[PDB]
Structure 1
C-alpha cells in the first residue's frame, strides 16, 4: 500500500524513517511544504487550508493513508482532513498523548510545544481526558532576533530554568512537542533531571500498525514546495544517504 506523509519541513523525515524501517515493503510519498515553512505562527484557518492542499496533493499521488507529522497541523487540521480526503488520516498528537498517559506514574505530565500547537489545547484536553495534570509551555522563539551567541552558557541554562519553571519537580514524563535552541533535549533533561521523554515519532510509526498492510515496492519519493538552501544536505544527514527530491508540481 502507499503511505503519504507531510510536514512543513524536514522534521517529518524522522517519522518517515521509523515507518520505512518498521514497514519494509510499504511505498512512501513525502511532501514538505518548505515554501511556507513557518506554519506554527499562522492562524488556525490558514493552517487548515495549507494542510488540505498538501493532503490533497498526497491523495492525488494515489496514497492510501496520510500521516501529518506536524504538531500544529495535527492540532487544527485533522478533522477537516478526514472529512475531505477519503482516507485514514493520522496525527502526531494522539500517539504521544497515549504514550505519555501510559509511561507516567504520577499522571503529572508536561508538554513543550509550538506557540500555535500549545494554543490549540489539543494535548492539554487529551491529556486531561486521560486523567492528567498537564504542564505545558510554548517553544521559545529566539533565532529571528538573537543568535546562539548571547544564548550560550549562562543565558542558555537560565532561559531553560525560567521556561521549565512550573515543571521543576511535579512532572515525570514530557511530550517534546518541539525543541528549538536553547531548549534542546540534552539541556532540558539536565534541568528537569532525568524524566521520561516521549518519542512521538516511534509512537506514531508504531501506531499505524493495524492500518498498514505491509506490502509494496519499498519506493520513496521526496517532494518539497520550495527547494530551500541546505535542504538537499539535511536529507543526506537524516536519511543517511542522498535522495533525489522533486519540486511539488514539477513533472508531477
Structure 2
C-alpha cells in the first residue's frame, strides 16, 4: 500500500501527518504544485488540468490511492481524476461535510473557503442534500494588495464581523475551508464564539480507513514542482524534522 497525497502547496503536509500517524506502515509520496501554487483563482478547466497532471505524476509513481488535500481541486477535479486514473481518489470536501452534518445540532452550518471552491458550489450542495442550511462566504485575498500588518488591530476585528456577518449567531458548526489572514481560526472562533470547527484533515484521514491496507515499508517521499523559497523551512516546522524533497521531474 502506497498513498499518494497531492496539493498545491504545503497545506497538505497536515493530512499527510494524520494519515501517517494512523496508517503507521503505509508508504507515502507527496507532490506539491509549488510552481503553480496560487491555484484557487484559476479556472475550473485549469484546476482539472493541473490536477490531472499531478495525479498522473503520482500514478506513475506507483501509488494505490490518490488523496487530493486541496479544496479547489477536490471541488472541480474528482470526477475527471477518477475517470482517468484507474485508482481510488479521495478529496477533502465530502469528509468535511459528513463530519459537519454529524457534529451539527441545528444543521445551520457554514463554510469559509477560497473564492474558486466557494463558487463551485460543491460544499453548499453536499450540505443541503444532507439536510442543512449552508452559510458560505469566500476567503479575502489580501496579501497581494496590502500587507497583513495593515490588517492588524482595529481593522482586523472589523474585517471579520463584516465577513462572518450573516454567520453571526446562526451557525453552530463550521468547515474552515481555507484560512487566510485576518480570518485566522482564533480571530473567527472569537467573533463567532466557541463554535465547532471541523478538522478537515482529521476527518479526511479517518475517511480512508476501509480503502487503505495498513501495510508497506513505512517510507516517505516528498516532491514539489518548484523548490520555492522557504519550502524546506516550512517542511521542517510542520513535520517536526527535515525531510529531503526532490524536484518533480528530477532524477524521476
TM-score relative to the length of structure 2: 1.00
CA positional deviation for 1:149: 2.1
SS at match of 2:35: helix
For each residue in 1:78-109, what CA deviation from the matched residue of structure 2 results, as whole angstroms up to 9, or x when unmatched?
00000000000000000000000000000000
Gaps of at least 5 residues in structure 2 are none
What pairs with 1:70-85 in structure 2 (closer than 5 Å)? 70-85=70-85
Alignment partner, residue 158 of structure 1: 158
Cα distance in structure 2, aligned partners of 1:188 and 1:135: 14
Is residue 205 of structure 2 the alignment partner of residue 205 of structure 1?
yes
For each residue in 1:195-226, what CA deviation from the matched residue of structure 2 results, as whole angstroms up to 9, or x when unmatched?
00000000000000000000001100000000
SS at match of 2:242: coil
Gaps of at least 5 residues in structure 1 are none
For each residue in 1:2-50, what CA deviation from the matched residue of structure 2 results, as whole angstroms up to 9, or x when unmatched?
0000000000000000000000000000000000000000000000000
Counting matched residue pairs gives 252
CA RMSD of aligned residues (A): 0.3
Is residue 140 of structure 2 the alignment partner of residue 136 of structure 1?
no
Cα distance in structure 2, aligned partners of 1:236 and 1:196: 29
Cα distance in structure 1, aligned partners of 2:149 and 2:123: 33
SS at match of 1:183: coil
Cα distance in structure 1, aligned partners of 2:242 and 2:206: 26
Does 55-64 or 146-155 show the bigger shift?
146-155
Cα distance in structure 2, aligned partners of 1:222 and 1:213: 21
Alignment partner, residue 241 of structure 2: 241
Cα distance in structure 2, aligned partners of 1:69 and 1:80: 16
SS at match of 1:246: strand
CA positional deviation for 1:118: 0.3
Alignment partner, residue 59 of structure 2: 59
What pairs with 1:179-218 in structure 2 (closer than 5 Å)? 179-218=179-218
TM-score relative to the length of structure 1: 1.00
